[PDB]
């Protein structure tokens, strides 16, 4: 069976090649080179770099909503709590749980800068670090 398949493939390939013969000696035309060598080049390229694109699109870091319920408790260990309080709210408008106005954020940031002293470089470094910490949160990611 395998021998017959082999012979058949060679024969019909010879027939195909004899169907549309091309003159000898003439160098390959530009047209056929652009339609034959190109697609294999892009094929190898995207074969190599398709998993990377798939992974980059698949990672897709997400986001989650802000808290609505906050609780606090104060107690002596091993006994019922001495104080407990609740702060609910989803509109972020009531005084119990709300966002921060940009004026308050600007005031805090301005106060962070002037905390240092003129001589010590450690004070300057601390001020820089504390300011860099705050700027990672927009006013829409701060809760009072």
């Amino acid at each position: 069976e395998n021998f017959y398949a082999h012979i058949f493939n060679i024969k019909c390939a010879r027939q195909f090649e004899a169907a549309y013969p091309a003159p000898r000696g003439i160098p390959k035309g530009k047209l056929v080179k652009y339609m034959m060598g190109f697609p294999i080049i892009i094929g190898v390229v995207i074969f190599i770099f398709s998993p990377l694109l798939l992974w980059s699109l698949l990672n897709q870091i997400g986001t989650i909503s802000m808290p609505e319920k906050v609780t606090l408790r104060i107690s002596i260990e091993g006994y019922p709590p001495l104080y407990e309080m609740e702060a609910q709210g989803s509109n972020h408008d009531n005084a119990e749980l709300g966002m921060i106005k940009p004026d308050q954020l600007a005031s805090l940031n301005q106060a962070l800068t002037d905390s240092y002293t003129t001589r010590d470089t450690n004070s300057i470094l601390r001020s820089r670090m504390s300011v860099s910490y705050l700027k990672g949160y927009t006013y829409e990611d701060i809760l009072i």
Partner: protein, 96 residues
């Protein structure tokens, strides 16, 4: 969870496919080992199809003596490259 994973492991599986596929599939189709040139580079593959068609035609008309004598003939052609060339060369129809 993609992040949750270890870059080590994912990079491993990726390079592993590129290598298993590169060494199994692409190599095979683009290349042709030098031994397999005496069997695929055959000027005229029509004198060998006749023997196979004969052994298939004989298989239906009984004649199991003939079904073995001619199968043995095909076996020696793939053992002797000197005769395979002598039999797969062109005929007078192409020669003139």
């Amino acid at each position: 969870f993609l992040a949750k994973v270890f870059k080590g492991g994912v990079i491993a599986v990726y390079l592993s496919v590129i290598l298993v596929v590169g060494r199994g599939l692409v190599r095979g189709i683009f290349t042709t080992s030098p031994s397999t040139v005496m069997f695929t580079e055959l000027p005229n593959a029509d004198h060998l199809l006749k023997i196979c068609l004969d052994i298939y035609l004989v298989r239906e008309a009984k004649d199991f003596m003939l079904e073995q004598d001619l199968f043995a003939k095909l076996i020696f052609l793939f053992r002797s490259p000197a005769t395979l060339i002598e039999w797969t060369r062109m005929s007078k129809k192409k020669q003139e």
